[PDB]
Amino acid sequence: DPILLRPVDDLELTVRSANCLKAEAIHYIGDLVQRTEVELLKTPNLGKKSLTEIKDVLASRGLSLGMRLENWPPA
Amino acid sequence: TTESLRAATHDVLAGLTAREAKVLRMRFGIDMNTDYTLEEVGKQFDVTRERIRQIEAKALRKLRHPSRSEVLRSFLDD
Amino acid sequence: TPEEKLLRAIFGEKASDVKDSSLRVPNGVSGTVIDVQVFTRDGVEKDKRA
Amino acid sequence: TEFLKPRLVDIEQVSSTHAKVTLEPLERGFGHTLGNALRRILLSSMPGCAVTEVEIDGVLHEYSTKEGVQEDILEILLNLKGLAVRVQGKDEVILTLNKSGIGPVTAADITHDGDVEIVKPQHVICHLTDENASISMRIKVQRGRGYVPASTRIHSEEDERPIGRLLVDACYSPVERIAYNVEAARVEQRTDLDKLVIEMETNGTIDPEEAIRRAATILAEQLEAFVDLR
Amino acid sequence: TEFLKPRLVDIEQVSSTHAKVTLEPLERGFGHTLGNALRRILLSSMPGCAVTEVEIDGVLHEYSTKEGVQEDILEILLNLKGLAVRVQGKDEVILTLNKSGIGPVTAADITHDGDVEIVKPQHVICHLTDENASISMRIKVQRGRGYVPASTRIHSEEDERPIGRLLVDACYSPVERIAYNVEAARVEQRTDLDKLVIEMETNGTIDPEEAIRRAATILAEQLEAFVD
Amino acid sequence: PTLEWFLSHCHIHKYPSKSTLIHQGEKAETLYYIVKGSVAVLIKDEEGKEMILSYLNQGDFIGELGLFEEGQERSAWVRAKTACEVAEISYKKFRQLIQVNPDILMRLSAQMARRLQVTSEKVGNLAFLDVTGRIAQTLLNLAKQPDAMTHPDGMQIKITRQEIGQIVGCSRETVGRILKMLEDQNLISAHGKTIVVYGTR
Amino acid sequence: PTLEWFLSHCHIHKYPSKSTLIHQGEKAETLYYIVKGSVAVLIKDEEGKEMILSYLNQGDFIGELGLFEEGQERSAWVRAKTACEVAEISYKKFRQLIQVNPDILMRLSAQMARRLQVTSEKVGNLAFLDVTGRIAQTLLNLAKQPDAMTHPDGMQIKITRQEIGQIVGCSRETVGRILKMLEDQNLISAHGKTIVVYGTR
Amino acid sequence: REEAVVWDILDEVIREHPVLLNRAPTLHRLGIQAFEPVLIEGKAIQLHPLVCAAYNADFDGDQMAVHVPLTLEAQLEARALMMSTNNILSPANGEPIIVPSQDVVLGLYYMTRDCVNAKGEGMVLTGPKEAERLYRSGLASLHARVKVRITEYEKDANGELVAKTSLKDTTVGRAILWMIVPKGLPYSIVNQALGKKAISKMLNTCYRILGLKPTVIFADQIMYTGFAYAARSGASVGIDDMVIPEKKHEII
Amino acid sequence: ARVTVQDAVEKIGNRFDLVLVAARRARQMQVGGKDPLVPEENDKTTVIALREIEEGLINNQILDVRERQEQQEQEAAEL
Numbered sequence A: 001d002p003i004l005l006r007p008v009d010d011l012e013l014t015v016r017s018a019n020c021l022k023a024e025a026i027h028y029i030g031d032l033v034q035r036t037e038v039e040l041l042k043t044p045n046l047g048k049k050s051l052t053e054i055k056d057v058l059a060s061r062g063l064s065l066g067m068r069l070e071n072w073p074p075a
Numbered sequence B: 001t002t003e004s005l006r007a008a009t010h011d012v013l014a015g016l017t018a019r020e021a022k023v024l025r026m027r028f029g030i031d032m033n034t035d036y037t038l039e040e041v042g043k044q045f046d047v048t049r050e051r052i053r054q055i056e057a058k059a060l061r062k063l064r065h066p067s068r069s070e071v072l073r074s075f076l077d078d
Numbered sequence C: 001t002p003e004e005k006l007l008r009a010i011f012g013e014k015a016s017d018v019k020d021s022s023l024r025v026p027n028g029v030s031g032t033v034i035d036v037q038v039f040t041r042d043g044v045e046k047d048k049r050a
Numbered sequence D: 001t002e003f004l005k006p007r008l009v010d011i012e013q014v015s016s017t018h019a020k021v022t023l024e025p026l027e028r029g030f031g032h033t034l035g036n037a038l039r040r041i042l043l044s045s046m047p048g049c050a051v052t053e054v055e056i057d058g059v060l061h062e063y064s065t066k067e068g069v070q071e072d073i074l075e076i077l078l079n080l081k082g083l084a085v086r087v088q089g090k091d092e093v094i095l096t097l098n099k100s101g102i103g104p105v106t107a108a109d110i111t112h113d114g115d116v117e118i119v120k121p122q123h124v125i126c127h128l129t130d131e132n133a134s135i136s137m138r139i140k141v142q143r144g145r146g147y148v149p150a151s152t153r154i155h156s157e158e159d160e161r162p163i164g165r166l167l168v169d170a171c172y173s174p175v176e177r178i179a180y181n182v183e184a185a186r187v188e189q190r191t192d193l194d195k196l197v198i199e200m201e202t203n204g205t206i207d208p209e210e211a212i213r214r215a216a217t218i219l220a221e222q223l224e225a226f227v228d229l230r
Numbered sequence E: 001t002e003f004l005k006p007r008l009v010d011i012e013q014v015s016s017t018h019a020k021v022t023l024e025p026l027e028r029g030f031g032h033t034l035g036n037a038l039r040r041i042l043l044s045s046m047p048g049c050a051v052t053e054v055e056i057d058g059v060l061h062e063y064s065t066k067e068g069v070q071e072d073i074l075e076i077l078l079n080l081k082g083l084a085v086r087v088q089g090k091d092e093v094i095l096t097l098n099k100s101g102i103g104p105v106t107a108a109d110i111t112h113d114g115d116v117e118i119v120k121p122q123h124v125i126c127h128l129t130d131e132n133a134s135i136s137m138r139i140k141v142q143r144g145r146g147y148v149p150a151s152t153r154i155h156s157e158e159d160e161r162p163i164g165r166l167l168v169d170a171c172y173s174p175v176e177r178i179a180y181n182v183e184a185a186r187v188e189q190r191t192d193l194d195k196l197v198i199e200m201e202t203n204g205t206i207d208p209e210e211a212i213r214r215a216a217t218i219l220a221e222q223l224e225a226f227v228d
Numbered sequence F, G: 001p002t003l004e005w006f007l008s009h010c011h012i013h014k015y016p017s018k019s020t021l022i023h024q025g026e027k028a029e030t031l032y033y034i035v036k037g038s039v040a041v042l043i044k045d046e047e048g049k050e051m052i053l054s055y056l057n058q059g060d061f062i063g064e065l066g067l068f069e070e071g072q073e074r075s076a077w078v079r080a081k082t083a084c085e086v087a088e089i090s091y092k093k094f095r096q097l098i099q100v101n102p103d104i105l106m107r108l109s110a111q112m113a114r115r116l117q118v119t120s121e122k123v124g125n126l127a128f129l130d131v132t133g134r135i136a137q138t139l140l141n142l143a144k145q146p147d148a149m150t151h152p153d154g155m156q157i158k159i160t161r162q163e164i165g166q167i168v169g170c171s172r173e174t175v176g177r178i179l180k181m182l183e184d185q186n187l188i189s190a191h192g193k194t195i196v197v198y199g200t201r
Numbered sequence H: 001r002e003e004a005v006v007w008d009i010l011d012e013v014i015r016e017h018p019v020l021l022n023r024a025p026t027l028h029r030l031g032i033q034a035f036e037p038v039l040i041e042g043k044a045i046q047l048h049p050l051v052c053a054a055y056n057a058d059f060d061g062d063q064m065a066v067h068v069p070l071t072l073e074a075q076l077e078a079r080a081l082m083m084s085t086n087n088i089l090s091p092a093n094g095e096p097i098i099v100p101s102q103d104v105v106l107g108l109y110y111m112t113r114d115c116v117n118a119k120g121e122g123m124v125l126t127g128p129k130e131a132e133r134l135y136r137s138g139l140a141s142l143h144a145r146v147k148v149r150i151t152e153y154e155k156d157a158n159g160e161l162v163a164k165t166s167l168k169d170t171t172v173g174r175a176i177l178w179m180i181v182p183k184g185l186p187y188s189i190v191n192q193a194l195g196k197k198a199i200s201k202m203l204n205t206c207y208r209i210l211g212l213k214p215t216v217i218f219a220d221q222i223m224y225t226g227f228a229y230a231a232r233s234g235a236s237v238g239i240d241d242m243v244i245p246e247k248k249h250e251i252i
Numbered sequence I: 001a002r003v004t005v006q007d008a009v010e011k012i013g014n015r016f017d018l019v020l021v022a023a024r025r026a027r028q029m030q031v032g033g034k035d036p037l038v039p040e041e042n043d044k045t046t047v048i049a050l051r052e053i054e055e056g057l058i059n060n061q062i063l064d065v066r067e068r069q070e071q072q073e074q075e076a077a078e079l
């Protein structure tokens, strides 16, 4: 999709969550959605609420978590 | 074009925290005959200078954010 | 103005120190280019196509 | 009701293009009612195959020229609008032509595809005055009906085409001249009955009986809207 | 082949006998075709029954007259062309009217066979000024199609008729008027398209929609041999 | 949209956990809506043992079977899966706004049709399958329910032996033993409360 | 009424006894209404054992779950009890019927209410009571019907041990044995298919 | 980019939005008028021929100018003061300035005419319509005195109509032409071959009696049919229409 | 009403007062957004003005009365 290929700062993320993302080598939103929730919760600084509001904003702009890709990355 | 532009800008400014919007107004001479500075934001808000630079940055995230960008996007082709 | 000042403070975009002065079709017109001619001074480089 | 239908009889091919159709038997008021009504359709809404594009080596625009040739590009193009070609299988073809030597350039010289009929080999195209000179082109033909000019295409077509493709207007409408005559179809008694005799003149490229069949077919297709749709 | 077809949009109907029809959209070159051809078949080939001949007692030729009557013979004859008649079993009938008194002579007073419908039974025919005058007539109605005048009929007729039997221009085809109009209708990029607006106005005996339906029915019924 | 016009009219109460929503047999006089949270519908027997009817998530009008005939009762218990904000509707007003707008019984056509469809295979499975199939397809359907979380090899969910024993119609340690067999069959991972199924999607 | 307006517009059809009305698995495109007669609902399993779910007489709606959800499959079997007659219309008309007057789906909502509550009594009775309990209670149940015939000491109904075995879900012959137990206790009489029940009224 | 909604919205705004037309030299106030727009696929204005005369205008290469009433008040003044309906008469004199010019009038004078010669003389009609059946069939002369029935009206009462019918020995084209007339005028007005003057005072009478609007409508019909039958009429010129009197040479 | 403005004049009596009153109403409607009385029928505010004035629903007196009453009641609401 045209929205697979965006950096996450178009979502206007937060500093703690941003540190969580850059800390975990998660580059593309296609790389985001291929990651699973429990693969996030165990990670540093990602407990209750990061998952809450990131779930909110992805509920806003029409996508969800944990989805599955194929032919990734086209780069 | 200038008018509809500027009104849209102020309508984006309304949605922020107070210090954010007022700082980002007077820091650029917006809405006044003034032209106020990072240093002078130090003088008025509180002497902290470059956290205002980081605040400017954070606001640019808060506002650029392509859910608000698209009233501004027509003005990209300016 | 403070506004566009803020806008390229957002996008970081900029101008050059140069303006456009191109030759264009005037509105309402369409047609077929078939020949071009160029004239240049004895003393300045002939721009390559010349 | 003392109705009676008209039934085809004969076709008299005076020539490839010039040919008439004696047609009978009609009641009163139907000779003209069918004459004009079919004239309009045979003239207006008949399809055919005609050139729409050409492309030539060594050329940018149709106003340019060529060594070893009399004709400007335009005169050749206009000598290609009026070409007579029939396709059977396809809805588009791209032919080619290649020639050298001093002489008149006609259609017999063309790279003919297997599934295409040229009606006249001697549709004159160009003339060659230099021995050494050489011509080579491609010819896109399509199929359609009516008048469809190039300028309406580029008006429609934003596709930034490659320079060289010299574009051409389309007159798909194949019929040229056409008439009818309301004579008196003989029945013994009902001698008010009429025969319609339709004089037809077109290019090649189009069968007459099939033409009439398409005309009447289209007509009935338009009449369903007055019999079925109320 | 990239034909377009119309969609019958409206049938605006003032009375039962007066009717309007808008009709769009059409490729250019058909509105006049359809309007003309239908106008022809309508006005010159639609079947129907009508007053062919008359026979009245004490009545010889139209230039003569009856006594105790408002009309001459002629105004009556015009009050007979304007008649709504339907035969339902036959192709021919002969009605009778025997009237007296000062009754402005309606078609209601007529004695009707079972296979006859007069759609305008109020239709006035004559007027008996004094009551003492009383009439007996008989009216041939015949089934045909189109219009044919009694003048051309006597030109046609060599078989002897007497003085007493009269003849009227046959109004078989139930239309009184039609006219069409080619307007231009819009498709978004295409204003070169044309609609066909029709006014038809008939006698009784038919609803106009049905009449047109029969006309196109006839015409396709002529075309089936060349759709082939 | 639609939902705005209908929440415009409603009266609300906030529900704590651990308690009762519906009392079976009492006068059914109100329809409800799940404003937020989840719930577990169920029913008792003479002896008092519980046996779960289903769970329910967001997007549910609740307490509907009493809407319809004059003088009906509550045909089931409904118990707290979580704390839940819940709406309030009367039935004369139900006549009013079904009449001036027919889209709400279009919605209840949606929900109730789902409920007797899912119940259709509840009883349809209740006839035939074996306990393997009972709890297996049970946890498949709970893997379809959104209350489960995503595990990188499948779906994780948190539940005890007792309540699933109240799902499939058997005892708790029976499902414990066949569960551990199912672990040995390599179709789940299982630590106490937190159980996980793989093979989803 | 008002049903006059409804069936004035419907498409009408008759069909004989034991014909297959609805096929489990076909698409959701048509509602049906029993105009005259009775019909029986059953289901089918991997094994082919048939299990009568319900049975309904004149004045009831059939084909109701698929009305809303675009492209559902038929979640059960329904076969003719007798030669019987039905009116039918498809779904695109019923949106015109709910948008103009939602009373029809009130009627459907009430019969569907009684439906789902007797389904609750069904799954409970199937769940807890012993064989004698639910066979006895379902005997009490079909004693209610208009199909049931009057007897000076109570009622009498014709049914085989097979089909009653298909509503309780056990073998016809064990139903024979418990029938003998109930004849020994002087509560029911029976010859072949004609059972005669005391205690009613 | 000239998208599709451009055109639909153009048609959306233009409706009920009049527009001004002007030809030089703007001598008198009827040289400048307010019409309604009609959109067409061309680069050339069309115009309502009858109002060429107030413009003294012809289609010999002339050019006209267009202005726009932006503000609402000018728009209403345009629809009410500069409108083509409000102005059919001069303030200099009260003559019709809607005088049918040169083609329509030929169609009339050809149609309403009383020959002797063609055919269909001396039968009888119940009205105009079956006459239309005849000529649209092509059975009668268009110009031939024949008996018909008609039904005129009259407002003898307190501006209240007073009906009647009768017979007339009058031509076919005149009967056909009676279809349009608005229920207040005699039949004598059409009972002649309708020279240009007869039409001028025709419209005069229609105005003076009925008020305005039928005189407009009437007139439009009179334009259309006049062209139409004129195209039917057949018309040309040729060297033998110009005939030399034999007795010129000898006078000389 | 659209193509001819006669009957409107027959109601009031003058072109000028007709266009002034009509423009006043259609400026209550073009900007003030107040509702019409005669149906809409897909027409710009000119026609609806001329109709409301044709059938006798709007007049300079009537406009004065309406604006008067709402103004005065507003003055009561202020105090």
Ligand SMILES: Nc1ncnc2c1ncn2[C@@H]1O[C@@H]2COP(=O)(O)O[C@H]2[C@H]1O
Pocket (backbone or CB within 6 Å): F022, F028, F041, F053, F054, F062, F063, F064, F065, F066, F067, F073, F074, F075, F076, F077, F078, F115, F116, F119, G116, G120
């Ligand atoms: N089979 C079922 N499926 C879904 N919900 C049910 C079922 N049985 C009962 N309920 C719910 O439990 C409620 C108990 O009271 P009511 O009968 O008023 O309405 C009932 C429904 O909301």
Ligand SMILES: Nc1ncnc2c1ncn2[C@@H]1O[C@@H]2COP(=O)(O)O[C@H]2[C@H]1O
Pocket (backbone or CB within 6 Å): F116, F119, F120, G022, G041, G053, G054, G062, G063, G064, G065, G066, G067, G073, G074, G075, G076, G077, G078, G115, G119
């Ligand atoms: N629990 C049930 N009780 C009664 N009838 C049912 C049940 N489940 C399915 N059916 C019937 O089976 C039919 C299958 O298709 P429908 O869902 O359209 O309509 C259904 C009902 O007629």
Ligand SMILES: [Mg+2]
Pocket (backbone or CB within 6 Å): H057, H058, H059, H060, H061, H062
């Ligand atoms: Mg001039």
